């Protein structure tokens, strides 16, 4: 009942004072807090309220109670920070166990309250009710923990680790090893808490930061500054790099994978390399704004909106149409477009991924996140030392785990592994592209045979069961491996690895993959394109080839390419270079001209080539106009030789045996 | 070379040149279309001069500007009381004295929309006084109904003013008092004229309906009339 609920809330509130309090003799305005008794029992019973009740009833009500009484912010942080600062001063000089006991048990609650949140069709209605609100409260937690004394609780958590670093692994009991798992399990949460995702019941078709929270409190930029001052990056670096020497790998190296995922996520590598500067580029951007303004002006009438006359347009067969406005009098292109634009209908439309936190897989990544200069250089230093120090030893362990455990996996661990691989391999390639001090040997553990098998196997199994999110990530990982191979061939075993990578079975898979992309989201198709470009380019420099290229060329691939190309207002300069490379391959080299004589391509080239779309001076117009010229020349030749193609141009090609051969050629 | 945008034109020159003898009549009978044609002719000619004579002037600057013709000396002046319903939408010429001018009124020309959920934006063209609001948000992944909304202070506006013109005593009927007519004037010509000024004008003689109440589309049978000036002298 409501009264039983509030009785438990009141029980918690009383426990929220039995804990202790600051001293009003002190005349120190204010002092720190001061300590209660039964407090062991207080902490333990709170732990029981989580584990023995809320978990067993699947509620999150208990968390709502502790959030009501602000336990984290009010007691746990000063209890820990006082323990830390006391022991720090004692170390400067250079029952006490009971104090240390309190330090352990306060931290374990911090891990529990900030643990990240999952919702399914098997979660209770209680949890589904409370999801949106507890998100707000965890955001408050992240801000607070990073703020206190400029984040000093984070020194307490690593000092706890330092006690268990201390003495030889040969001594270290299972209970002892849990501390070293626990500490790293904390930092994962503090990075993982981020602004909410809005969710509603789909009964009818019709921000969540609380008043005390703002973006600069919560941004990844902040977290960098906070960890650096409070001495975290040294701990993650030392701990990962000596990992091979007999720290029991089993307890550390998955939590330590999740950290690296959880703050590589949302960085584009180009933002870490530069390739008054801000003001200069701002001025240039204002020039671009002026061009857009000019485009609007070129469609704007001189005289006002009620001056306008009326226009009539007569067709062949003497039938007439009517359009209004003063620009229609002079511009037939505009009149024709304006005529169709009035018409009401649009055909309604069809729509791939859920269950996991925001990442490259389901967001447009043409949108950076933003760094102070000190933060930029500190972050660059952290991951550069990580790569030069830790990467091979980490990947070798985590991969030779997962080969023995693949059957037992869960979707997240698959998507973590595939987006840790991808990031670090790409970033190193870019860094050594830039400079000679860097080298490729640092990432060279990715190529050895076991990992290649494992990325292959993940992609295989994901594709067969029609799990499209793992398939998407696996596509991204398998792209980079191929990219790295072409690098190393441009310098023995690598050719053996290629020959095994391009057994016939895999060519069947990698040929299959663009065909299904037509239905799905804009990123999926983009992954398919970039993988295809790489896949063909390697086999070009193998010297088989004619068998493989004919395997790619057919209607359902071309359909995907156009369906992707028409959203060009959103895409990069580089991706369109890739698409026209492929059309050059289909049209000129392979001489399979009949695929592209289809009408929705001819519309597209007008839109994109018009004064509407692609800029008059972008590099894209060089490629596009050089393509269309050749297109229309060959089309002219075909149409005059055989006039039936006028009715051909609307429809798909015709698959009958007796007429179809002459049709295609 | 003076950086200016309007060209005077006395209509008698259209009668002197043989190829435009009929264009003179078409101007009086169809002003709204013919004047627009003349505007887009002048702008193109200005561009042609700099590109043909290959001069140093910025093509973008000329493309950005609006150019307008202002015809005048069209024919005989017409008595204010003798305008009849067969003169609607034809060019007229009037003489008179200025009584008063209202302050400048902002007139909207372009509307600005923003999506409430995904922050997509669209600029829309105003014609015939009606805002062509979109049915759904046009961003592909945010194809939602009622999702766009108007932002007043990011629209674009233009100046309108109303001038009250009185009949000159030379035309008043015997034993009667002079009448007056209202002139609508835009952009360049807005603040030109003061109380007590004596002028001659040229503009289309227009008429429009008026509503019975502000709640509903019900119109009255009598129509309001006014003059839409394109030149003042």
């Amino acid at each position: 009942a409501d009264f039983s609920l509030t009785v438990l809330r009141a029980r918690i509130a009383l426990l929220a004072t039995a804990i202790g309090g600051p001293d009003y003799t002190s005349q120190i305005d204010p002092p720190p807090y001061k300590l209660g008794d039964d407090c062991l029992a207080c902490l333990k019973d709170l732990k029981r309220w989580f584990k023995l009740v809320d978990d067993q009833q699947k509620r999150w009500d208990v968390a709502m109670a502790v959030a009501e009484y602000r336990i984290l912010t009010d007691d746990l942080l000063p209890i820990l920070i006082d323990w830390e600062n006391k022991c720090s001063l004692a170390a400067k000089l250079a029952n006490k166990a009971y104090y240390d006991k309190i330090a352990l048990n306060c931290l374990q609650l911090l891990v529990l309250m900030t643990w990240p949140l999952i919702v399914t069709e098997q979660s209770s209605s209680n949890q589904i009710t409370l999801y949106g609100e507890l998100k707000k409260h965890q955001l408050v937690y992240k801000k607070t923990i990073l703020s206190m004394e400029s984040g000093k609780v984070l020194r307490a958590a690593i000092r706890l680790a330092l006690d268990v670093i201390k003495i030889d692994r040969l001594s270290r009991t299972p209970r002892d090893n849990m501390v070293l798992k626990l500490v790293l399990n904390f930092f994962r949460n503090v990075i993982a808490i981020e602004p909410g995702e809005f969710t509603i019941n789909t009964k009818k078709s019709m921000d969540t930061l609380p008043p005390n929270v703002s973006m600069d409190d919560i941004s990844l930029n902040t977290v960098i500054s906070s960890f650096h001052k409070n001495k975290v990056f040294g701990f993650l670096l030392t701990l990962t790099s000596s990992l091979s020497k007999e720290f029991d790998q089993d307890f550390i190296n998955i939590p330590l994978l999740e950290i690296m995922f959880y703050f590589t996520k949302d960085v584009n590598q180009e933002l870490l390399f530069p390739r008054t500067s801000a003001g200069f580029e701002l001025s240039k951007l204002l020039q671009k704004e002026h061009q857009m303004r000019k485009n609007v002006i070129k469609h704007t009438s001189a005289r006002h909106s009620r001056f306008g006359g009326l226009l009539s347009i007569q067709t062949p067969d003497k039938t007439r149409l009517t359009v209004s406005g003063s620009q229609a009098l002079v511009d037939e292109k505009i009149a024709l477009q304006k005529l169709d634009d009035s018409k009401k209908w649009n055909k309604r439309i069809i729509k791939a991924a859920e269950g996991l936190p925001n990442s490259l897989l389901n967001s447009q990544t043409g949108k950076a996140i933003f760094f102070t200069e000190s933060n930029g250089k500190h972050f660059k230093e952290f991951i550069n030392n990580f790569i030069d120090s830790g990467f091979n030893i980490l990947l070798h362990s985590v991969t030779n785990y997962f080969t023995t455990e693949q059957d037992r996996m869960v979707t997240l661990e698959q998507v973590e592994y595939l987006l840790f691989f991808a990031w670090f391999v790409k970033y190193q390639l870019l860094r050594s592209k830039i400079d000679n001090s860097a080298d490729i040997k640092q990432v060279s553990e990715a190529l050895k045979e076991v990992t290649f098998i494992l990325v292959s196997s993940l992609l295989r199994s994901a594709y067969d069961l029609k799990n499209w999110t793992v398939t998407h990530a696996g596509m991204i990982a398998f792209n980079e491996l191929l990219n790295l191979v072409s690098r190393t061939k441009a310098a023995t075993d690598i050719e053996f690895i290629v020959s095994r990578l391009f057994s016939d079975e895999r060519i069947q898979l990698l040929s299959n993959l663009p065909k299904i992309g037509s239905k799905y989201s804009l990123q999926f198709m983009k992954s398919c394109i970039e993988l295809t470009h790489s896949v063909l380019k390697v086999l070009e420099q193998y010297s088989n080839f004619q068998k493989v290229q004919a395997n790619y060329m057919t209607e359902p691939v071309i359909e995907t390419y156009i369906n992707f190309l028409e959203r060009f207002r959103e895409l990069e300069d580089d991706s369109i270079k890739k698409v026209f490379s492929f059309f050059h391959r289909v049209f000129v080299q392979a001489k399979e001209q009949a695929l592209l004589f289809r009408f929705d391509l001819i519309i597209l080239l007008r839109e994109m080539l018009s004064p509407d779309g692609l800029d008059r001076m972008s590099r894209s117009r060089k490629y596009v106009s050089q393509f269309s010229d050749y297109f229309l020349a060959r089309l002219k030749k075909r149409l005059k030789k055989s006039p039936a193609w006028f009715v051909g141009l609307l429809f798909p090609p015709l698959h009958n045996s007796e007429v179809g051969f002459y049709q295609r050629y | 070379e003076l950086g200016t945008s309007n060209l005077n034109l006395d209509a008698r020159n259209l009668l002197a040149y043989k190829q435009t003898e009929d264009l003179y009549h078409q101007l009086l009978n169809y002003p709204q279309e013919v004047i627009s044609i003349m505007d887009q002719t002048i702008k193109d000619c200005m561009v042609s001069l700099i590109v043909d004579n290959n001069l140093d002037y910025d093509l973008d600057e000329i493309e950005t500007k609006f150019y307008k013709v202002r015809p005048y000396n069209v024919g005989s002046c017409k008595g204010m009381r003798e305008l009849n319903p067969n003169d609607i939408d034809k060019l007229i010429n009037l003489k008179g004295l200025v009584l008063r001018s209202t302050p400048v009124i902002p007139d909207m020309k372009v509307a600005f929309f923003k999506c409430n959920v995904c922050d997509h934006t669209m600029a829309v063209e105003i014609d015939r006084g009606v805002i062509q609001e979109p049915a759904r948000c046009e961003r592909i992944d945010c194809n939602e109904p009622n999702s766009m909304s108007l932002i007043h202070n990011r629209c674009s506006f233009a100046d309108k003013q109303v001038i009250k013109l009185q009949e000159t005593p030379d035309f008043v009927p015997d034993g009667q008092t002079p009448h007056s007519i209202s002139l609508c004037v835009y952009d360049e010509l807005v603040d030109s004229c003061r109380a007590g000024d004596r002028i001659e004008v040229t503009g289309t003689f227009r008429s429009i309906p008026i509503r019975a109440n502000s709640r509903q589309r019900v119109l009255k049978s009598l129509y309001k009339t006014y003059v839409d000036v394109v030149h003042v002298k």
Binding site: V119, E197, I200, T202, S363 | C118
Partner: peptide, 11 residues
């Protein structure tokens, strides 16, 4: 219940 996230929300 037909719970659903605004997966498309990215501004």
């Amino acid at each position: 219940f037909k719970s659903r996230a605004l997966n498309h929300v990215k501004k």
